[PDB]
Amino acid sequence: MKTIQIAIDGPASSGKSTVAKIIAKDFGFTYLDTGAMYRAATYMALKNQLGVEEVEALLALLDQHPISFGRSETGDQLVFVGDVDITHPIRENEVTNHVSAIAAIPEVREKLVSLQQEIAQQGGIVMDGRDIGTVVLPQAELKIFLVASVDERAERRYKENIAKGIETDLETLKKEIAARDYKDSHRETSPLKQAEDAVYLDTTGLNIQEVVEKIKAEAEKRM
């Protein structure tokens, strides 16, 4: 087998983390999340006040940063950028706010993409994201496309908001998702439309284990 990448795409994917995780847990592939990639990039931005306004500089720099991931002794995927293992500084919300503002830049995404390839360069890595339709996929042995319905996902979110100690209304998520879902399904850049050879597989309100098997079978057989 040597080593091979495992990319997963979809409108939302209600089993990308678990699936991609379980897979690498058995095969031993390095797990990578498009989010962390942007986290490391945005992190440096705020670190050296490289606001989006500095696309030129931040661009050449983003590529200069020897970014990479690694599993912490305590089973914690840390983000390594600039030769500094940072897993805490790479928050979610704070990093998201800057990540969204940063990612907005075209030159940024392009460079950040090159990094994704640098990670899987050695081979044997499971990656999952939304902008993985025309970039790393083309060079990804195994590529799956988990599809779902706004209703299904929108529901899973409503609960997660409740169980967390809140009382978010469904009607709220339903609408909110309708706006984003559209804006995402009504653009041009990073057009999904199913990758070149993206394995189509929809799992609506279906068990998670059922998905892991589906992919596993596709990989084992392909091998």
Swiss-Prot record:
Catalysis: reaction(s): CMP + ATP = CDP + ADP; dCMP + ATP = dCDP + ADP
GO terms (BP aspect): nucleobase-containing small molecule interconversion; pyrimidine nucleotide metabolic process
UniProt xrefs under CDD domains: CMPK
Pfam families: Cytidylate_kin (PF02224)
Cell location: Cytoplasm
Binding site for ATP: G10, P11, A12, S13, S14, G15, K16, S17, T18
Annotated InterPro entries: Cytidylate_kin, Cytidylate_kinase_dom, P-loop_NTPase
The UniProt record lists the keyword Cell membrane: no
Keywords: ATP-binding, Cytoplasm, Kinase, Nucleotide-binding, Transferase
GO cellular component: cytosol
EC class of the enzyme, as a word: transferase
EC number: 2.7.4.25
Gene Ontology MF: a single term: dCMP kinase activity
Homology family: Belongs to the cytidylate kinase family. Type 1 subfamily.
Protein's UniProt name: Cytidylate kinase
